[PDB]
């Protein structure tokens, strides 16, 4: 009875569509129509960070807003002091095709990973002093696209085998495995409370997961192409996605709907990175046209354009205190704006 | 008074840069290759975990070959990593289902990608003995063979059928039909004919890489 299951699934998705179209009593634009506009926002490159030989695929801020890690496909992790533009560490990797890097909230660990299907975990605060590898977590089938810590003992990884995983670093084992994406899972973002996370794959679908119940809660559609970036809203009741269809979209977790699209007629390049401000009123987005637009989140108006990279920007991150935004790009340069 | 704390930072950074310079000079002295192919294509014959790494040295020049082992057949997200390589080695079984047209479609997609516009291809058309012994024993799958005539640059070895030459030159022209329609001097195509066992392929990759680097330099000076 394959056809019966097909028609059951279609009846179910039509019931979901009916349940969603009854809760859209008004649009976000109709409610934020009277808010005063944010004003044109102009940032400047405070610091430019040089030292990487090749393209930068990943950066992650530290939780103290000074230290910053970056990954280059020449095979080096570098931890920078952004206030002084000093390289605090420089870690040689074993496989050069790094594609993700993360920073532990405690500050004693850094995780890399890429086309080797392994997530390595480096110890920065070691008894001797030089940065060695603590664990190499094998067990994925495809490349490692993202990874985020939870504590110094847990880490969630996203992969090209259509699977997210939860790891226990002391054992090297896979606690929970997350299944459901039919395409390569390209991004993650943890909630502020570390009880959920949302992932976006190359099937135009974002899914919400329960880290302790190990199950998928809601599924969000609306994009027309692959989802490259996901960032949570500052309170954990929304998130924003970037796609290859040159649009960002804003979804709600309690309405189970999409609220806003951030698109322009002169934008035909895909989106790489996404970030919210500390207030959540601006949405920063990096594009393949080497720029970074700054949107009004409560509206759909562009408040500024960060210009200055001469290749594909692939990385964004706003600090925990909200002082700076840091961009990396395929021109092997990091920039800090303010 | 914490210049005590800042001079230590400057010293650590100085040591990091003096090592990064050595890493730079060993990075830019090495060439990187992406071995790409299909199943049953002879990609493993040329070699003789998501990434397999092969290191070798021809004429005191260090090459670094990579082969994607444990990845799925999606390719549109991890092939963007292998821009900024010298060449993409592309292996094709030139001999059930049409694998020749599929290799053609893959070559077309690699050629016209927005990020691989600057990367060139060393085309290896494998399995020439099989092609020969099948043509003496192609028109069903490609209707323009009976229309096709052997090129003026036909240079077979002494002892060759005039009809196997035509098959292999037809396949080469079918790849050059794609590589010629776009690019106009940012990336190139280096087609070659290889059998099962022959050791000239390493020297061929060496020569093609020399040509690629020379063209890069002549383009920096705006002479090409």
């Amino acid at each position: 009875e394959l056809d019966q299951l097909r028609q059951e699934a279609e009846q179910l998705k039509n019931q979901i569509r009916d349940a969603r179209k009854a809760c859209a009593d008004a649009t976000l634009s109709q409610i934020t129509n009277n808010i005063d506009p944010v004003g044109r926002i102009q940032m400047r490159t405070r610091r430019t960070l040089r030292g990487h030989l090749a393209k930068i695929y990943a950066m992650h801020w530290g939780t103290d807003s000074r230290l910053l890690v970056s990954a280059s496909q020449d095979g080096k992790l570098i931890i920078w002091d952004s206030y002084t533009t000093n390289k605090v560490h420089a870690i040689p990797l074993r496989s050069s095709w790094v594609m993700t890097c993360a920073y532990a909230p405690s500050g004693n660990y850094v995780a890399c990973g890429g086309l080797d299907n392994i997530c390595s975990i480096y110890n920065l605060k070691t008894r001797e002093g030089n940065v060695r590898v603590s664990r190499e977590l094998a067990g994925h089938t495809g490349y490692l696209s993202c990874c985020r810590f939870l504590d110094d003992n847990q880490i969630v990884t996203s992969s090209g085998d259509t699977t997210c995983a939860l790891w226990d670093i002391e054992t090297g084992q896979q606690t929970t495995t997350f299944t459901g994406h039919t395409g390569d899972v390209m991004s993650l973002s943890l909630a502020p409370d570390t009880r959920l996370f949302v992932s976006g794959a190359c099937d135009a679908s974002a899914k919400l997961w329960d880290v302790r119940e190990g199950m998928c809660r809601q599924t969000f559609t609306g994009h027309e192409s692959d989802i490259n970036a996901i960032c949570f809203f500052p309170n954990g009741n929304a998130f924003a996605t970037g796609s290859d269809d040159a649009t960002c979209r804003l979804f709600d977790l309690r309405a189970d709907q999409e609220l806003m699209t951030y698109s322009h007629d002169n934008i035909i390049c895909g989106i790489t990175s996404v970030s919210f401000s500390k207030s959540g009123r601006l949405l920063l987005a990096g594009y393949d046209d080497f720029n970074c637009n700054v949107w009004d989140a409560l509206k759909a108006d562009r408040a500024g354009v960060l210009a200055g990279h001469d290749n594909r920007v692939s990385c964004l991150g706003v600090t925990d205190d909200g002082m700076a935004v840091a961009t990396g790009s395929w021109d092997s340069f990091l920039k800090i704006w303010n | 008074d914490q210049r005590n704390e800042e001079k230590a930072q400057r010293e650590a950074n100085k040591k990091i840069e003096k090592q990064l310079q050595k890493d730079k000079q060993v990075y830019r002295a090495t060439h990187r290759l992406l071995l790409l192919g299909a199943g049953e294509s002879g990609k493993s014959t040329i070699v003789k975990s998501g990434i397999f790494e092969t290191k070798f040295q021809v004429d005191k020049v260090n090459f670094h070959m990579f082969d994607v082992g444990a990845q799925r057949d999606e390719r549109r997200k991890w092939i963007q990593c292998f821009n900024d390589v010298t060449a993409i080695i592309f292996v094709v079984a030139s001999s059930q289902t049409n694998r020749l047209q599929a290799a053609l479609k893959l070559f077309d997609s690699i050629w016209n990608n927005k990020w691989l516009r600057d990367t060139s291809v060393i085309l290896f058309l494998n399995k020439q003995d099989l092609l020969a012994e099948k043509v003496l024993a192609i028109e069903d799958y490609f209707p323009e063979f009976a229309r096709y005539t052997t090129p003026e640059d036909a240079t077979p070895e002494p002892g060759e059928d005039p009809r196997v030459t035509r098959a292999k030159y037809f396949i080469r022209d079918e790849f050059l039909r794609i590589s010629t329609a776009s690019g106009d001097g940012r990336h190139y195509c280096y087609p070659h004919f290889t059998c099962a066992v022959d050791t000239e392929n390493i020297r061929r990759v060496f020569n093609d890489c020399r040509d690629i680097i020379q063209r890069m330099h002549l383009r920096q000076y705006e002479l090409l």
Partner: nanobody, 126 residues
Framework: QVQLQESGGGLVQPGGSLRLSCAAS????????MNWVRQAPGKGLEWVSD????????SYTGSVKGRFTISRDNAKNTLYLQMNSLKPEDTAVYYC?????????????????????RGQGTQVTV
């Protein structure tokens, strides 16, 4: 949601004809390049025909040139295939595949076993 549903398959006397159709929903049909793939019983997914954003460039595989015809109707969001002079070697389930990203001259992984922007198929048995 991206949705592609094909229609028109059936049993055809060898030498007959069919007109397959593909309705698309969830995206701007005019920004993409569209495809037809094919899965014969016991064999892999092969490629039949593409068409550009405006139907200017059209490519066919070798064993369908002169017989098949592709066409778009961007206002009606429908893609077509006209199969003429059918052979027993054409018995396969036919899909309507869409290239992943818009405005791109290339598109990659259409004949993959797990491809997202592909319909569920329709059966033609000559």
């Amino acid at each position: 949601q991206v949705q592609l549903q094909e229609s028109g398959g059936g049993l055809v006397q060898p030498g007959g004809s069919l007109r397959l159709s593909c309705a698309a929903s969830g995206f701007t049909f005019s920004n993409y390049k569209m495809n037809w793939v094919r899965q014969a019983p016991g064999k892999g997914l092969e490629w039949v025909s593409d068409i550009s954003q405006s139907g200017a460039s059209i490519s066919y595989t070798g064993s369908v040139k002169g017989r098949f015809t592709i066409s778009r109707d961007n206002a009606k969001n429908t893609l077509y295939l006209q199969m003429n002079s059918l052979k027993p070697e054409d018995t396969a389930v036919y899909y309507c595949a869409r290239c992943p990203a818009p405005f791109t001259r290339d598109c990659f992984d259409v004949t993959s076993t797990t491809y997202a922007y592909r319909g569920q198929g329709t059966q033609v048995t000559v």
